[PDB]
Amino acid sequence: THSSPTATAWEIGLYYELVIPKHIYLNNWNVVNIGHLVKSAGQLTHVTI
């Protein structure tokens, strides 16, 4: 906004985005599906939920 050899001035525009939480969850586990093998009419088959 101003530029002398002994003086300066600047302006900065900052925009902020604050997420407001509804609930916070701390003690958490990841799921790992393993399933089960089934041997049916000769064929081996992997079964999963």
């Binding site: 089960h36 089934v38 079964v47």
Partner: peptide, 17 residues
């Protein structure tokens, strides 16, 4: 149309000695 197998993830049930 026959009834098929049942699975219940019980290890103790499938023990072989």
């Amino acid at each position: 149309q026959v009834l098929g197998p049942v699975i219940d993830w019980n290890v103790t049930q499938r023990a072989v000695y």
